[PDB]
Amino acid sequence: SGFRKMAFPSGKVEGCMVQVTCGTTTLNGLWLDDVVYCPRAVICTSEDMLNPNYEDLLIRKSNHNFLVQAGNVQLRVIGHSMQNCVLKLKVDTANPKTPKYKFVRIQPGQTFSVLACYNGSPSGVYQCAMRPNFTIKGSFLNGSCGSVGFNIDYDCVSFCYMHHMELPTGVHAGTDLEGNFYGPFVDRQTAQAAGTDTTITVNVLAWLYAAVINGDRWFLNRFTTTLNDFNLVAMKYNYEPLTQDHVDILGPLSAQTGIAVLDMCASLKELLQNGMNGRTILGSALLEDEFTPFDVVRQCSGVTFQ
Amino acid sequence: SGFRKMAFPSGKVEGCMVQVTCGTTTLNGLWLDDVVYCPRAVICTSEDMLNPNYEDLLIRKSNHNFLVQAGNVQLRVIGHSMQNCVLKLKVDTANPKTPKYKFVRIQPGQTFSVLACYNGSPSGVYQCAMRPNFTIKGSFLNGSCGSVGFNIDYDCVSFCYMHHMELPTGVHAGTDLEGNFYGPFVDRQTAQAAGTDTTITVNVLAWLYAAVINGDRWFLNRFTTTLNDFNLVAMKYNYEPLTQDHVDILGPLSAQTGIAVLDMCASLKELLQNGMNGRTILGSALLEDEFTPFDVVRQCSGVTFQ
Amino acid sequence: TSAVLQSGFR
Amino acid sequence: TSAVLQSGFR
């Protein structure tokens, strides 16, 4: 029993974190095989950051202008190239701790674990979701740039996020591991703002199913709803439209609990209209939307507390 | 910016997790140097669990009655002994991944990271607090017994919790790494219940300071309070009494924000009396009490967003 | 109900 | 305000 914001064990990623320094600018890199991946922002100084031309800044660099440190060992850079907003630094040593890995670009509403890192040293791990507006509500300070987000499946680390910047609202923006930003953001210190965000409806429903699995049914009701009638209510509360694909993805959780997906939607509609009445669900007074249906199946018992 | 339930990087602990099997009963062990630590509940079968005599059950066992597996390598047990409610299994191989470590018995209200494990395989990491009633609100299924809780400081892992059981309220009970339970619980499947719990006041105050550090002041007021006048309000809301030691521990956070400790108590008193008025603090609609003052300093900027 | 020792089966 | 590239100083 119980239900926590649960991150993946971070050890396979900790073994890949290095420090990349160009001049006085330092950040984190990801050392996989003989390549170190880091944000291209490492080649800027404070006077370059409002509108850097990275192609022009990079051609002025040599391999020996990049200092890469893994713990206390220094890694020699023998080649470099820019791909989108990441640098790929070829080093003379393959990382012996390289896990089985993939690079994945996730959809909004998906979750991942973040290994917050400073000066190449992991400091903490927490769970995040990619918001519908393609920001994440992380916890990052200066020096965190290059920290990575990931999921793990059968000892394969799927890297999906590399951290770059903080927006004026205190939320965070970054790239996939090929250097493509999530959302419309660019890696320069300009007026940028996260677009209006919405609540991840399919995740809220998955979390309601988790509450039922763990033994709580107070929020259910005897009603049902059509998918269209639900979305007209969801839209007025700034919830994402629920699609038939979302309904199918909630299939396994609906089967385990005996609660039809559209019946849980009727429960959610009532929670949105009535509030919680000073009650909690899985220890939260708000509707939680950063657990995917996969996250619930991974953590919850396969046996419902009936 | 941002503020998350942040666990310690788990890699140093992942390298220590093994599987311990006695007959048909299996659970997790902690492999440090040439010793494997696990709950003594591993030597019981379903017919023994209501009132086992562990001393009588253990003398009927030989070293070869214990099967220890680290990944796929089998470790040979060359000695065994019981200490309180843990078994110490001497194995023929010292763990080459043994981190620098300590065993610590924590006070209630302290936090730690939990590496949830099944069949010796880490499955997830999350942050917990030791409740004032000496339970933890973990997330554990059958097979999790032997999972450990820990803190890390300068590459030293301080193990403070080994998981044993789930109480009828769905909260969890376990031991320090010497096998002494936290709270009045015993490792047998009997009528046991967590005592009445309270809210960790010093942690709520630390979290209010974190909210100020990150730029939010809406909940402050112009009042102050005496320590005694605060506790008379705190007691009626089931909050722990705040002591002068707690006031001193909040010293650094009070200095960084310029908010006297007793002034934040007056803010908390008003929040308890008035509620939140449909507002949130650091993304929560409830007062959060599972961040220590140390947790806040470790995660937050040293520079207040003024 | 009773406390549950959360050992596994094998 | 402006976005902030959260690199470190050394």
Residue numbers in the entry:
A (entry chain A), B (entry chain A): 1 to 306
C (entry chain C), D (entry chain C): 1 to 10
Study text:
Mpro is a cysteine protease that cleaves at no less than 11 sites on the replicase polyproteins. Then the mature Mpro forms a functional homodimer and transcleaves pp1a and pp1ab.
Further, we solved the structures of SARS-CoV-2 Mpro mutant (H41A) in complex with six cleavage substrates from replicase polyproteins. Substrate selectivity is revealed using structures of the H41A mutant in complex with six individual native cleavage substrates. We demonstrate that the subpockets (S1, S1′, S2, and S4) which are endowed with an exceptional selectivity are important for selective and potent binding. Additionally, other subsites such as S3 and S2′ to S4′, which have less specificity for substrate recognition, may also be used to enhance inhibitor binding and to specifically target Mpro.
